[PDB]
Amino acid sequence: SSGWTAGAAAYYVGYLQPRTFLLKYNENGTITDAVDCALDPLSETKCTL
């Protein structure tokens, strides 16, 4: 119960939510950039346009 030690390691947990996203694909088929729609007005305009 006590004769142990924990090494240095970390993790982060974030909860998914229903949202709209814009995604860009390069010429090789992979994603390079994305925009979270409805984050800030600038992102909202990127999303609309």
Minimum Å gap between C-beta 45 and another protein is 12
Distances (CA, A) of 12 to 5, 9, 15, 37: 21, 11, 10, 23
**By beta-carbon distance, which residue lies closest to ligand NAG?**
28
Question: Which residue do the tokens 């090789």 mark?
Answer: 28
Contacts (CB under 6 A) with ligand NAG, residues 1-49? 26, 28
Backbone gaps in the chain, preceding residues (C–N over 2.5 A): none
Minimum Å gap between C-beta 48 and another protein is 8
26 binds, among ligand NAG, another protein, none (CB under 5 to 8 A by kind): ligand NAG
